[PDB]
Every structure is written in C-alpha cells, then in structure tokens.
Design a protein around this ligand. Structure first.
Ligand SMILES: O=C(O)c1ccc(C(=O)NCCO)cc1
Lengths: 270, 270
C-alpha cells in the first residue's frame, strides 16, 4: 500500500541467491566520521526510487569486517546498507546504540549530500538497524526508540533485558545456538522474550552456531548464509519496505524444519 | 637443580592424558574477592611439596568458564591453578593485567590462609599466568613485570605490542590461526615478535583455530587439547618448576608437523 516495493515478486531462490537483484557499489566512510568509526555504504546501482537505509554495527573489539557480509547482501536486495566500525572496540552496547543512531543520522545526512552516491536514494523515514553481539545489544536499544522500522540483532549481547520491553520495532533476533560469548540463555533468549508479543518479532536460533553464526560469510563458514539472507532480507523487505511479498518467508515456513535453525520463535502474523 | 620437580619423568602420553598424574579438587573464590571477579582454585590432592601457582584469566565479557579447562588440566599436573572471572566483562587488558596480579596476590594470600585448601601448597615465588584474548593481553602485560615465571597468552588481544619488548618471562603464546577477534596478524604475532629473542618464548598457532582455540574444551571441539596440554603443561613445568624433563616437549619437536599446529616459532633452546 505504501509503494516502497522494489524488485520482483520474491522466491526462496531469489532470497538465497549470492546477491539480490541489484548490483552493488560501495562508498567509503572514513573513520573520521563523527559519531562512529567509519564504514562502508553499500548501495544498489540499478534500482529506481528511494529505499530504506540500514546500518550494521559490529560487537566488542570487532571491526566492520565482522558484519560486512550484510552490506552487499542487503544492498543487493534494494537497500542502502552502511556497515560500520565503532569509535572503540571497547564500546559497550549503549555506546553502540548511540553510534547506530549516529550512523543512521549519517545516512540521512549523506542522503542529502551532493558528494554522496546515495544522495537522494534513501527514504530517511525507513531505517533498519542490525548489529552483532554488543552491536546487537545496541541494535535492540535502538529498536526501543521508535525511529527504526526494523531491527536485526545478530547474536546480541547486552547487560539487561527489561529495557527491551520498549521494543515496538519489528525485531528479528538471530541467535547462535552454541554462542558462548553472548549465550542465548542470558542474551538472545531474554532479549527476545522481553519484547512485547504485540511487536512483530522473531527469534531464529542458528543450529550449532557459534557467536559469529549470524554475521554471514563469503568464504569459509557460509553455512548460515541461506537462512540469514532468506530471513534477514525478508525481514528488512517486510518491515522497512512494507513489502508483504516477503511476508511468506518470515511468517508461514516451519523455520525449525530448516536444518540450520535449531529454534524459531515469533509473533506471526505481523 | 631447584628441586621443584614433581611427578614422573613425563611422556607425550602423560602430557596428552585427560588429566595429569594428580587428582584435583576445586575451591571456590566468590566474586566478592577483592581485585577480580572470583574464580575456582584447582589444586592437586595427592601431591607432596609446594607447587607453582597459576592464574588463568578470561577475555572480554567472557566468564571464567571460557578458560576453565586449564584449571583441572594444569592442576592435575602439579599446580595450583585459579581460573578466574574479571570484575567486569568490559575490563580491558590493563585491567585484566591488574586482576591477574590481584589473583596472583590472592593465591599468595590464600597460601597463608588456614581457610584455604591450598594453604601451604604454593611456592609463592613460582607464579604463572595464562589468559585468553584481552586476558592474554593482560597475561602478556603481567609477563613484563618480573614476578611471574611463565606466561601463556591464549589467543591474546591487546592494543599495542611495543610494551611486550619488556617481557623477559618465558612466554608461550597460543595463537588461533583463523582468529577474527584477536587476529594473529595484529595481536599474537606482533606480541610474540615484540618479546626479545633472549626471552624463552614460543608461538604456537593452532591450525584452523578460531578465537577460542586455545581455551581447551571437554567434548565439544576438543581437537586442540593435545597440543594445549602437551605444550602448555610442559611450558609451565619447564618454566615454573624448572623441570627440565619437560623441556623436550617444547624444544625439540617439529611442532609444525603436528596437524593441530599451523605455525610454530620459538627461541629454543631456553
Ligand atoms: O575473550 C575475548 O576477549 C572476547 C570475547 C568475545 C568478544 C566479542 O564479543 N566478540 C564479538 C563482538 O562482540 C570479544 C573478545
């Protein structure tokens, strides 16, 4: 109804393809950028119209590289995706939340900058956040604030869960079953549980996943890319683009029948 | 020569055994302990004489459990080993160094405490430190100080390497080949390189190892336990006990011919 739909009527095959329908380019953000540690703006080059913006933030002492897989992946599906680094690897979730916000602000700024290749490409109303570990805690925190329209914490790490009762943002938590850094039992699980059941939410625990299981990979350890692409892209399509054509990949499937998904929870329908 | 030798003339089989020659017990250290986040004192129960004390410290936002494997492992070979937690998961290497020192101090204190099961069991002159990731940075930092007689950083993470030119302590760095949290190229390798070649040192990169590869494991992913036990126990025996019977396991073998060791460097002979 909102007219943000882009690209073909999707298919699992489209979602699990190495890249989405759009060619992607990258634009550097120096670490001199205010409010975060720089990053890479990934954007599609053969789309029309404006598109939602997504910031993907790493976890503790982790560089952008840790979550960079998500940039081209999501951008290829019709999003401006800035994978970023943090001011310090030591940044805690609250700081990462602030930097997520700063990075979102930055994409909004760059959307209006003649020097940016995404100038005029972003519907700045339509903002998604993603983040690994402490960055996933930051993501969940940003998901409480009412600006972003989708949040995908990746193996989130945070220090308390009750703050996330304020999440009305559609939040898909990728959990890593065997996460020993942000153990599901003390992080992804209570964070997910804290989110109101009225919130569009999903808990996708990746079978056998260690702490990096939801970061994607382009070389070794790519075994979760299908579910990450399928659910993550659809999540962002569904909630950032209001693209109901992607609903069926997040609400409908028996996710746990996926060999890569050890546990699924969600509040379907959305 | 120093008379600290304990246990039988070793063999690889002894070193790679599930446990060393000694039964171990554990004694709890509440997190209320001053100067670190509590821990577990592992000590052998059917030993005679005093033994060196080892503190094993975890990395960022990691609990003692992350490195706990080393407690029983080393204790069973004739050491008092306290696996500890940190005050905060957010503690940085310098703080972990201080907590390593506090934990060492604590073992020295407990050695003189009628309430400690290791009272009178510790030769407080003979101190080893081990630590994972930022705890390994802390370990390397403590290794600069002149009090400890052996240091085993496990996939160490730290923010600068030049400080480690001050390491005269026998330092065995376990590196994890595919570490993406403390990339060998920017952590274990320059930390090892910074140590003077006059220092007894070793760099043991575990083949295919992720960031936890040097932490040990009981069942799930235990594929490095042999090299960790063989080289780690021998390191501590050699340098804490001056037990030259263990020298041949650290100086002599073609370490890289071990299928678990992707790279070895060292300053043999010691
Ligand atoms: O043992 C460590 O020092 C250590 C453990 C976990 C992290 C981490 O959380 N990495 C993912 C991003 O948060 C960093 C360091």
């Amino acid at each position: 109804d909102c007219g943000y739909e882009r690209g073909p009527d999707p298919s699992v095959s489209l979602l699990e393809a190495s890249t989405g329908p759009f060619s992607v380019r990258t634009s550097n953000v120096s670490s001199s950028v205010r409010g975060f540690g720089g990053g890479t703006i990934h954007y599609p080059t053969n789309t029309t119209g404006t598109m939602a913006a997504i910031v993907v933030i790493p976890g503790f002492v982790s560089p952008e590289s840790s979550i960079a897989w998500w940039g081209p992946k999501l951008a290829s599906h019709g999003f401006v995706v800035m994978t970023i680094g943090t001011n310090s690897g030591f940044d805690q979730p609250a700081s990462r939340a602030s930097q997520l916000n700063n990075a979102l602000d930055y994409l909004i700024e760059q959307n209006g900058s003649s020097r940016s290749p995404i100038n005029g490409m972003i519907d700045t109303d339509r903002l998604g956040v993603m983040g690994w570990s402490m960055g996933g805690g930051g993501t969940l925190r940003v998901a409480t604030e009412g600006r972003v329209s989708a949040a995908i914490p990746l193996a989130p790490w945070d220090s308390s869960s009750s703050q996330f009762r304020s999440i009305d943002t559609p939040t898909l938590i990728f959990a890593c079953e065997n996460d020993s850094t942000a153990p599901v039992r003390s992080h992804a699980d209570p964070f997910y549980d804290a989110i109101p059941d009225s919130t569009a939410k999903a808990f996708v625990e990746l079978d056998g996943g260690g702490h990096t299981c939801a970061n994607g990979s382009s070389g070794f350890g790519g075994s979760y890319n299908d579910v990450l692409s399928r659910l993550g892209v659809s999540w962002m399509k569904l909630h950032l683009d209001k693209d109901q054509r992607y609903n069926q990949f997040v609400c409908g499937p028996n996710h746990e029948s996926d060999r890569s998904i050890s546990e699924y929870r969600g509040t379907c329908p959305y």
